[PDB]
Amino acid sequence: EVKLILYHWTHSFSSQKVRLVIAEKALKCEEHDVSLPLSEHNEPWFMRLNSTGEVPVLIHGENIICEATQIIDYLEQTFLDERTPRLMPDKESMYYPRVQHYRELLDSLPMDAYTHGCILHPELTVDSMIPAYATTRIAKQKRLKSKLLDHDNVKYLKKILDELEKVLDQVETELQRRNEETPEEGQQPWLCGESFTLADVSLAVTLHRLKFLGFARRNWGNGKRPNLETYYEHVLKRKTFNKVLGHVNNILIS
Amino acid sequence: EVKLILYHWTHSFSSQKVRLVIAEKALKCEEHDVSLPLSEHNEPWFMRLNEVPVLIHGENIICEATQIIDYLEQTFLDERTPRLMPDKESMYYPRVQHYRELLDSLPMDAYTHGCILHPELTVDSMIPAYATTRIRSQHDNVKYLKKILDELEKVLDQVETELQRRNEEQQPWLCGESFTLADVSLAVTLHRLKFLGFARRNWGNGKRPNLETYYEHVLKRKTFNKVLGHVNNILIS
Fold first, then answer.
1. Domains and CATH numbers, chain A
2. Is A35 in contact with B9 (Cβ distance < 8 A)?
3. Could you describe the post-translational modifications of this protein (chain A)?
4. Residues B93, B85: contact at Cβ < 8 Å?
5. DSSP chain B
6. How far is Cα A167 from Cα A112, in angstroms, rounded to an integer?
7. Inter-chain contact A64–B56, Cβ cutoff 8 Å?
8. Which residues of A touch B (CB under 8 A)?
9. Is residue B94 exposed (0-12), middle (13-18) or buried (19+ Cβ within 10 Å)?
């Protein structure tokens, strides 16, 4: 009866998680991309990534919910019709702690800082999908001030990239357990078991954004984290992921 | 042609502050009250007071009252548009910001629950008595409420003296001659206190007479009356 209304920036990381959850739950939503093809400074979305989409908002009848995690929690709790896929196991399920654990672990990642780091310090990326010209966009004194900021911001970026690796280690091990427990003839499982969950939305969208930023090759591929690599390949083939997010890394598409 | 869009609950304290700023700044806004006259439990708005408005303006999405209001002040700088804050370097800025922050720190949520839970502490509450009997069958139903009311007295103490300076020095407002964001915070605060039955305990009959005079001036202001004239009326959904 009451309409679902979503205001969002299509390319923002948060909007991607929200819109994928909506698609995975088969919900009808009136979605408003408020982002402009070209800004006041005639920039396209991939030159404005630090400007950032930030905060989507859902309106559902009399409820107003801002921010990705809060919106996703509202959706999972509100749409309980039996036709509606659930992205979370029942709170009494023996699988619930595992799913909740990886959901919070992935949602704790500082994605905004990775993106800012990508643009400010592209020498730490490999095959970033953002053009190099987005990066380009008393004298000893201020010189020294900015030298120090640069030193400080690189130590921060390096610290959180190491933390990302430790998180992706736990994920790789978890996916090894799924690999071990699944026959090569069976349908491939997701992160926490056979059903696609909220932890999968977070992991999937995180990996796709790491790819975009150029922090994929340091973290999987070429023999590194092969289960994670296979997972990402599985993600890209998922019909829902492709329908919702198939073009979001494509800078040719406004 | 950027549209200004507001989703809000009319009777929500935070929405009232936002909508009054919009009118004081003469901004055109597409306002959507999402509240329903009756809940699933057939409660009316005055039973559901325990919200988060959101502005959409072109590409910007702003949640919560204070952020929406700061966004409005920073963005609509056309010279025709009244300003509600003086200037970040002006010497009047720190005074306004201080009272804005002081008022905005009040736990309105606690007072409204307390009004309903412990109506013996109210005088002429506008909430029907049967709300007590329903809420009291089933956040903090404790005597601590009197301490939050005493703390309120101290904030209203501070306001009364600030008003005392203004008249000694057209009627002034709290912080000088022009209507500011601190007046917004104060006017909506007083009006809600009136609604809850905590006006007579805090002003009137010789108590805090500058505050009484201030509240009466607020009620006559065209913008306030046009936007908030009915919000204390339980006959109106």
1. 1-87 (3.40.30.10), 89-248 (1.20.1050.10)
2. no
3. Ubiquitinated by PRKN during mitophagy, leading to its degradation and enhancement of mitophagy. Deubiquitinated by USP30.
4. yes
5. -PPEEEEE-TT-HHHHHHHHHHHHTT---EEEE---SS-TT---GGG------EEEETTEEEESHHHHHHHHHHH---TTSPPSS--SSSTTHHHHHHHHHHHHTS-HHHHHHHHHH-GGG-SS-SS-THHHHHHTT----STHHHHHHHHHHHHHHHHHHHHHHHHH-----SSSSS--HHHHHHHHHHHHHHHHT-STTTSBTTBSHHHHHHHHHHHH-HHHHHHHTTTT-TT--
6. 17
7. no
8. 7-9, 32, 34-36, 54-57, 59, 61-67
9. exposed
Q: Do A36 and B58 touch (CB under 8 A)?
A: yes
Amino acid at B227: V
Amino acid at B89: E
Which residues of chain A have a CB within 8 Å of the CB of B62?
Answer: 55
Q: Distance (Å, rounded) from C-alpha A54 to C-alpha A50?
A: 10
Q: What is the resolution of this structure in A?
A: 2.0
Q: Is A118 exposed, middle or buried (0-12, 13-18, 19+ CB in 10 A)?
A: buried
> Tokens at residue A128, please?
């970033």
Tell me the two tokens of residue B150.
């005493």
